């Protein structure tokens, strides 16, 4: 290690600060100390009776929480999809080709409390299961996310698609409305049946009982907006996710870049737990959240915006990261991307262009790479005492100054405070 | 011309692409020098060898680094 | 006049047409060109050829690819 030492009367320092571990932990290593994904749903006590208890729960408040998994459980387990192709994820397979399977197929086990001090049961209930009862109670994780002016949005198609079957009904409230969902994404085994739906009819989706992913969906990639960043930043530059690697000019980003590529996780797996990592309990603690690639996450989404992103705009903006590096390393990388556009004809009727010769001439050379490639930009960078120039301050300037509503502590209200001035 | 590297100001290089498909990279003295107030304040002396004093004296068109890797500089 | 290749400012190349129905290109040196400093910065110098400062000499009004698929340049 380093030795620091104090001027003055030649002192031995030690520079410490206090420890911070709290690794991220990957999907694969789930699958070292157990085959199976354990999910703890009470034995059906009575289907049809059921159907009174969570009525009645979620019309006036106050639901049981085991209730709602038994009632799930009881009407989807009836569901079966042929296995056109065998199926397999990190070890376990869960079939072969020609068989036909459940939505269920992860492994249920029995919990031991039975039934819950009597929640309000109701008489009057017809077959209103399998139709639209179920499809609702699915999309209560949806609405258990969102806090902000959004969630009298997505509810809003809530109350039709339940519609689409027999009868128009609403359950919640207006005041503790959401304050009785934000509870269920905390029971393990709720979020295990979601996911496990979600996952059944990404296989079948040509099933006409695919129609419940109205609910299920936002939980596919939920704990991997990491990844989302990448993925948005190779669609806005137009340039392949190797290329866009090797744009990564901080040493922080690059170790993030590395942590979230790491091999063996079925990234780009068609059909796999992945997706669903928290959901599955196959990880406490995602690799892929925003939280723990906070340079990448700043870093990726600060281009982004200044390459026109509509998205980047309202992202949180990360603590305790280097952000006069990242943000130099940001508009070199959008100012590469906005200077050279892509620009070469794609068809022809009896003559077209070329130029694969006639690149400058010249020594009008006073500009510019002519490319996106990284080492000439570096070049070029370095020619101009590492110092972004005039010309790279207005074009960021520009991209920013139009914006607008910029909330506090976002890479919206930070480029703008940075670039406009 | 003054000094004794300003005579070669009218001959020039040429030097080879790196990059399969590209245009050799022609560059003489006087390019890359206006007069003699330039030629003083950048670094310029009359003892100069005629590659040194092109590549040092890359500085006017402020690309060194950059004609480094493309050409075999 | 200096340099060698400036001699040639009066004379001008003519170029062939692509397209039928179309005037040839008639371009010289001296309308490409300012009067000195203009071309001792571009990297016209002396020791190249007429074409050579002709294919170079597109650059004053920026015409270079636009004249190369309308001529037989």
Redesign the interface.
């Known amino acids: 290690s380093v030795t620091v030492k104090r001027i003055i009367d030649n002192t031995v320092i030690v520079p410490k600060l206090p420890a911070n571990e709290d690794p991220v932990e990957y999907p694969a290593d789930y699958f070292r100390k157990s085959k199976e994904i354990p999910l703890y749903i009470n034995t059906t006590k009575s289907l049809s009776d059921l159907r009174g208890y969570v009525y009645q729960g979620l019309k006036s408040g106050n639901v049981s929480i085991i209730h709602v998994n038994s009632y799930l459980y009881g009407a989807l387990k009836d569901i079966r999809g042929k296995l056109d192709k065998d199926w397999s994820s990190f070890g376990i397979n869960i079939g072969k080709a020609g068989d036909t399977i459940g939505i269920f197929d992860l492994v249920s086990l029995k919990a031991l409390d039975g039934v819950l001090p009597d929640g309000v049961s109701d008489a009057s209930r017809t077959s209103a299961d399998d139709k639209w009862l179920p499809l609702y109670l699915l999309g209560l994780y949806r609405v258990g996310r969102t806090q902000m002016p959004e969630y009298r949005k997505k509810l809003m198609d809530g109350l039709t698609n339940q519609c689409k079957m027999i009868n128009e009904q609403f359950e919640p409230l207006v005041p503790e409305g959401r304050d009785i969902f934000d509870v269920w994404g905390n029971d393990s085994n709720y979020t295990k049946i979601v996911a496990a739906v979600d996952m059944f009819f990404h296989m079948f989706k040509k099933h006409e009982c695919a129609s419940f992913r109205y609910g299920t969906i936002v939980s596919r990639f939920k704990d991997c907006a990491a990844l989302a960043t990448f993925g948005h930043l190779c669609k806005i530059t137009g340039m392949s996710t190797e290329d866009v690697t090797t744009w990564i000019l901080n040493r922080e980003v690059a170790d993030e870049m590395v942590q979230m590529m790491l091999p063996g996780q079925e990234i780009d797996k068609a059909d796999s737990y992945m997706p669903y990592l928290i959901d599955f309990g196959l990880s406490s603690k995602s690799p892929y959240w925003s939280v723990k690639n906070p340079a990448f996450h700043f870093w990726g989404q600060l281009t982004a915006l200044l390459l026109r992103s509509t998205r980047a705009r309202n992202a949180r903006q990360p603590d305790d990261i280097e952000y006069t590096s990242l943000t130099t390393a940001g508009l070199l990388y959008a100012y590469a991307v906005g200077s050279s556009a892509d620009l070469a004809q794609q068809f022809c009727v009896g003559?077209n262009?070329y130029?694969?010769?006639?690149?400058?001439?010249?020594?009008?050379?006073?500009a510019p790479?002519q490319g996106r490639d990284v080492?000439?930009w570096?070049?070029?960078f370095?020619?101009?005492n590492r110092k972004p120039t005039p010309d790279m301050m207005q074009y960021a300037k520009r991209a920013v100054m139009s914006l607008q509503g910029l909330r506090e502590k976002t890479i919206g209200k930070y480029a703008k405070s940075e670039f406009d001035k | 011309a003054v000094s004794d590297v300003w005579s070669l100001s009218k001959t020039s290089m040429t030097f080879q692409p790196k990059k399969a498909?590209?245009?050799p990279l022609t560059?003489s003295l006087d390019?890359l020098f206006s007069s003699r107030g330039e030629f003083i304040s950048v670094g310029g002396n009359g003892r100069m060898s005629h590659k040194e004093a092109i590549l040092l004296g890359l500085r006017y068109?402020?690309?060194?680094?950059?004609a480094?890797?493309?050409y075999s500089l």
Do not use: A, C, F
Request: aromatic content about 6%; hydrophobic content about 20%.
């Open positions: 003559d262009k130029t694969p010769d006639d690149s400058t001439g010249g020594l009008t050379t006073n790479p080492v000439e570096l070049g070029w370095e020619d101009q | 498909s590209l245009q560059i390019e068109k402020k690309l060194y680094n950059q480094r890797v493309k």
